[PDB]
Amino acid sequence: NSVEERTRIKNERYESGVIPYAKMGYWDPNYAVKDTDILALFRVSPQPGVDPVEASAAVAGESSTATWTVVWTDLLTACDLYRAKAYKVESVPNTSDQYFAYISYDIDLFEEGSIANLTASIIGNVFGFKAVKALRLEDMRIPVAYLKTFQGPATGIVVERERMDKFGRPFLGATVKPKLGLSGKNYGRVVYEGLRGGLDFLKDDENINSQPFMRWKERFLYSIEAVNRSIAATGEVKGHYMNVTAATMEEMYERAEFAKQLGTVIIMIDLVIGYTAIQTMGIWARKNDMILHLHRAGNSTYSRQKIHGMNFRVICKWMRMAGVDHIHAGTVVGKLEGDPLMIRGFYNTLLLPYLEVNLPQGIFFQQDWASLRKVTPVASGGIHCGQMHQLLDYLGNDVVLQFGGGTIGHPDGIQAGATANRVALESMVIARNEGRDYVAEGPQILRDAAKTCGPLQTALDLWKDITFNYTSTDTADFVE
Amino acid sequence: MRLTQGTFSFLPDLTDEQIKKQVDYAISQNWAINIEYTEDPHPRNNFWELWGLPLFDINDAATVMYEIGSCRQQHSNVYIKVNAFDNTRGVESCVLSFLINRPSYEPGFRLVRSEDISRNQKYSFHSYATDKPEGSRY
Amino acid sequence: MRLTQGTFSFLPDLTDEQIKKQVDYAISQNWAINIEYTEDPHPRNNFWELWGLPLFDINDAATVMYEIGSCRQQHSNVYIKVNAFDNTRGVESCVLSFLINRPSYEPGFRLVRSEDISRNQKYSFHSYATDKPEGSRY
Amino acid sequence: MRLTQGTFSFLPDLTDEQIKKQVDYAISQNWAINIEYTEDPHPRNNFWELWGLPLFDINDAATVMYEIGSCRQQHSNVYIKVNAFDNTRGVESCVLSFLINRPSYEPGFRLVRSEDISRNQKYSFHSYATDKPEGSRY
Ligand SMILES: O=C(O)[C@@](O)(COP(=O)(O)O)[C@H](O)[C@H](O)COP(=O)(O)O
Numbered sequence: 001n002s003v004e005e006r007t008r009i010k011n012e013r014y015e016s017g018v019i020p021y022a023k024m025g026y027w028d029p030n031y032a033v034k035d036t037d038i039l040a041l042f043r044v045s046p047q048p049g050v051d052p053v054e055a056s057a058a059v060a061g062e063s064s065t066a067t068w069t070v071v072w073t074d075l076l077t078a079c080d081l082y083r084a085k086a087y088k089v090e091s092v093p094n095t096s097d098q099y100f101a102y103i104s105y106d107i108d109l110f111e112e113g114s115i116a117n118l119t120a121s122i123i124g125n126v127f128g129f130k131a132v133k134a135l136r137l138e139d140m141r142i143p144v145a146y147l148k149t150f151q152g153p154a155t156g157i158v159v160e161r162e163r164m165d166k167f168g169r170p171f172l173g174a175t176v177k178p179k180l181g182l183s184g185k186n187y188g189r190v191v192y193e194g195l196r197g198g199l200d201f202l203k204d205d206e207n208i209n210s211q212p213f214m215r216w217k218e219r220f221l222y223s224i225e226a227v228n229r230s231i232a233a234t235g236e237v238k239g240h241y242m243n244v245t246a247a248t249m250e251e252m253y254e255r256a257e258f259a260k261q262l263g264t265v266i267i268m269i270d271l272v273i274g275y276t277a278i279q280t281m282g283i284w285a286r287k288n289d290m291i292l293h294l295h296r297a298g299n300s301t302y303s304r305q306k307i308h309g310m311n312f313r314v315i316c317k318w319m320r321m322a323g324v325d326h327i328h329a330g331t332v333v334g335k336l337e338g339d340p341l342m343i344r345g346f347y348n349t350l351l352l353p354y355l356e357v358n359l360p361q362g363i364f365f366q367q368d369w370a371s372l373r374k375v376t377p378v379a380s381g382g383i384h385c386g387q388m389h390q391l392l393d394y395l396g397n398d399v400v401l402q403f404g405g406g407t408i409g410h411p412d413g414i415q416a417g418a419t420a421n422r423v424a425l426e427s428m429v430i431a432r433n434e435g436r437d438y439v440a441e442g443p444q445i446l447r448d449a450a451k452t453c454g455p456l457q458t459a460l461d462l463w464k465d466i467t468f469n470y471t472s473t474d475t476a477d478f479v480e
Numbered sequence: 481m482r483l484t485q486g487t488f489s490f491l492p493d494l495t496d497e498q499i500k501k502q503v504d505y506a507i508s509q510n511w512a513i514n515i516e517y518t519e520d521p522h523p524r525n526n527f528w529e530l531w532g533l534p535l536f537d538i539n540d541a542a543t544v545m546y547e548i549g550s551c552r553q554q555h556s557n558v559y560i561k562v563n564a565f566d567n568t569r570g571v572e573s574c575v576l577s578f579l580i581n582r583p584s585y586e587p588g589f590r591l592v593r594s595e596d597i598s599r600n601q602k603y604s605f606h607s608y609a610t611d612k613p614e615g616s617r618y
Numbered sequence: 619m620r621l622t623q624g625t626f627s628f629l630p631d632l633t634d635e636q637i638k639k640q641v642d643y644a645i646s647q648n649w650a651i652n653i654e655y656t657e658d659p660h661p662r663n664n665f666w667e668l669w670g671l672p673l674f675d676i677n678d679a680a681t682v683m684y685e686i687g688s689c690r691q692q693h694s695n696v697y698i699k700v701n702a703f704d705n706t707r708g709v710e711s712c713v714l715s716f717l718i719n720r721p722s723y724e725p726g727f728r729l730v731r732s733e734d735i736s737r738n739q740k741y742s743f744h745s746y747a748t749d750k751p752e753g754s755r756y
Numbered sequence: 757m758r759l760t761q762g763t764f765s766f767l768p769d770l771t772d773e774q775i776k777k778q779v780d781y782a783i784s785q786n787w788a789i790n791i792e793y794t795e796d797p798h799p800r801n802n803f804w805e806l807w808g809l810p811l812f813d814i815n816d817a818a819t820v821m822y823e824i825g826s827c828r829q830q831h832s833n834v835y836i837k838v839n840a841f842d843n844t845r846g847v848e849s850c851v852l853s854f855l856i857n858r859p860s861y862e863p864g865f866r867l868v869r870s871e872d873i874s875r876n877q878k879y880s881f882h883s884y885a886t887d888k889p890e891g892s893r894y
């Protein structure tokens with residue numbers, strides 16, 4: 001017996017103990033969504049015996065203000081406002097115990113301009129909750145008022161095309177191969193041959209940073225020599241993605257500043273550096289007139305399986321906000337996962353000023369991009385010029401088509417490989433622009449161009465029947 | 481050497497019929513079209529000379545083809561390109577640019593190098609054509 | 619000296635009827651009320667000791683007056699204050715705080731000075747009451 | 757106040773039998789044991805005074821209990837603690853430290869504050885016991 005016992009809360013909601021999250025304010029099917037709210041769509045798979053609304057309310061609670069037992073300290077805050085609300089819970093089509101949960105979060109929950117803070121709430125703890133055996137974040141509605149606190153792309157595709165003086169076609173690129181083992185001088189050789197032969201860009205591989213077989217400075221030095229040789233040889237602006245990925249921010253800055261000092265138009269970074277280093281680089285790139293390419297290293301660890309993780313379209317949104325200028329977004333027909341309708345959703349999320357709901361493409365929220373600049377999608381991995389009609393159709397005009405093996409694997413050399421890709425691209429673009437059914441006629445369009453291009457003839461002969469036909473793991477829940 | 485600026489410069493020089501089809505494409509997208517020319521082939525020569533004003537709200541490809549011919553009478557010895565512009569918000573930029581005339585001989589560029597700090601060098605692209613004054617280059 | 623923290627400390631010590639009227643006022647605004655006490659009078663002693671939990675959604679002033687009385691009985695020799703809190707968004711803070719008990723004698727503070735760079739000094743407020751341990755101060 | 761340094765200070769002062777069981781535990785792990793004492797209770801007083809050398813390779817708890825009694829004859833008015841040390845590579849540190857004697861009255865600490873830059877303050881923990889010289893504190 002004491003003053004503590006005497007002043008205990010008798011109110012049923014705020015007396016001590018455990019009560020369901022759906023009775024704590026985190027379930028409200030009548031909640032009126034505000035235009036400033038952050039919305040999230042989760043695919044929720046409850047454990048046996050767990051109610052779908054309760055699972056959804058738990059996700060809402062533990063990603064906003066709740067814990068597992070009632071706390072009086074709620075009453076020191078405007079708690080009715082700060083609690084997130086699951087406001088719609090629906091069955092996912094063609095599943096037994098899987099649900100779409102729409103959750104609203106007030107704009108005041110979040111730190112302005114911080115991907116780390118947004119993700120700390122939305123994905124921090126809720127994916128490990130015992131009560132849901134699986135959870136996937138499918139989409140988010142980032143309101144205009146929160147988007148305005150972010151830079152968006154440092155450069156964006158419009159300014160990128162202006163810097164490169166290249167309009168009305170995809171960009172071309174290539175990853176240098178083998179992935180690891182080349183010296184700085186050999187790296188420069190490959191870059192020179194690829195650019196001089198017709199490619200707009202080449203790139204360091206994601207895992208090429210600084211290593212015993214090649215330290216970073218010589219690579220950057222030889223690479224800019226190769227670039228400038230190729231510019232003088234062709235009269236085109238050219239670039240090589242110098243990879244500044246490193247262990248610490250100080251090392252990344254040292255590498256980015258050196259690349260800047262050499263006059264590169266472009267650098268790259270890997271997703272594995274993480275969100276805070278990426279945002280830091282996005283700001284640096286805006287300040288230093290640099291195209292910032294993001295390789296999505298590690299993304300498929302959480303993005304591959306339909307029942308659990310984070311769909312890549314959400315990552316597209318966060319990285320566009322963070323300030324990258326390119327991101328890898330799929331090929332459909334190459335060696336990596338890529339359902340065509342999912343990919344269409346990714347490319348639209350990166351490039352459009354505004355998205356309408358489009359359930360077949362996995363676009364669950366209307367998304368105003370608040371005039372943030374546009375991210376150039378990058379199609380890379382296991383593609384070849386025999387697919388050029390398919391690439392132009394699935395992926396469109398605003399993309400970098402990267403052919404690593406598809407350039408350097410050419411039997412007549414790296415220049416020949418580059419020339420094949422460049423001729424194939426222009427042949428397909430001109431046919432599309434003339435109104436031709438270039439998808440139906442594509443193989444013949446490529447054969448016709450090959451009649452006056454030995455390198456293309458050889459590339460078609462070598463690779464034309466190479467396909468990567470496998471069932472997709474990441475697929476839509478609705479069809480047109 | 482062949483200057484490979486422009487969307488179609490790895491393909492042979494475009495015929496008037498090919499050019500008209502690209503103009504038709506631009507018109508079908510409601511893009512503004514203009515014609516520019518230069519005798520400085522530098523990759524960062526951003527401002528080629530204007531041949532009149534851009535043509536906005538174009539119904540007829542023949543109007544563009546007429547001006548192409550008229551520009552060629554004065555400047556077919558040098559570079560001429562056709563650009564298309566889209567003023568839709570979020571684009572507000574060129575969306576197509578291709579070469580329609582080239583000089584008979586393009587000598588290309590000397591890569592100039594200067595020694596700088598440690599192993600760093602400074603680079604410059606020197607156009608051989610620009611060894612002579614405007615009017616005497618090609 | 620008289621410690622003049624609190625909203626009404628330039629007026630005489632409040633009577634029980636004065637205190638009750640402030641409590642009624644706070645109840646009329648739907649403010650939460652709590653009671654706190656201390657024997658460190660430092661102006662930056664932010665966290666006076668809690669007398670139980672705050673009273674939330676209060677109907678009855680007599681209930682608050684009882685806890686005021688109960689705290690005064692256990693801590694009659696030291697400072698006691700009543701705070702009112704407003705959890706409306708954009709406030710979410712104390713909106714009224716006044717003293718309801720004080721020691722019969724407050725010796726106050728020594729101003730401590732240390733020499734620093736050039737003419738700058740560093741300052742500290744030393745409470746005479748804190749010359750003795752807690753429980754032996756007042 | 758009660759000084760709550762040591763592993764078991766939220767439990768009542770340990771009996772000799774409880775202490776012997778902790779000593780038995782230490783012996784069973786082949787930990788070295790020592791006894792230390794102090795009359796400066798500061799939380800960062802890292803070096804309490806040594807009562808002899810640590811006892812290494814101990815077979816018998818009674819040897820430790822003897823020295824505990826002997827230390828108490830000289831220092832039972834102040835703090836005495838028992839420590840156990842593990843010299844296994846990667847530990848090489850204390851692995852258990854508990855209080856076995858306390859003064860009858862511990863006045864505790866004054867929290868001293870000084871004004872610094874903007875809103876920052878500098879803090880010090882002043883032991884009331886240390887108001888008197890060693891030998892006259894407790
Ligand atoms: O390491 C590789 O495999 C690549 O360099 C491609 O080499 P090739 O061009 O020789 O296939 C790219 O990093 C992947 O395309 C990344 O995949 P995604 O674009 O899906 O993130």
Ligand SMILES: [Mg+2]
Nearest residue numbers: 175205206207
């Ligand atoms: Mg790679």
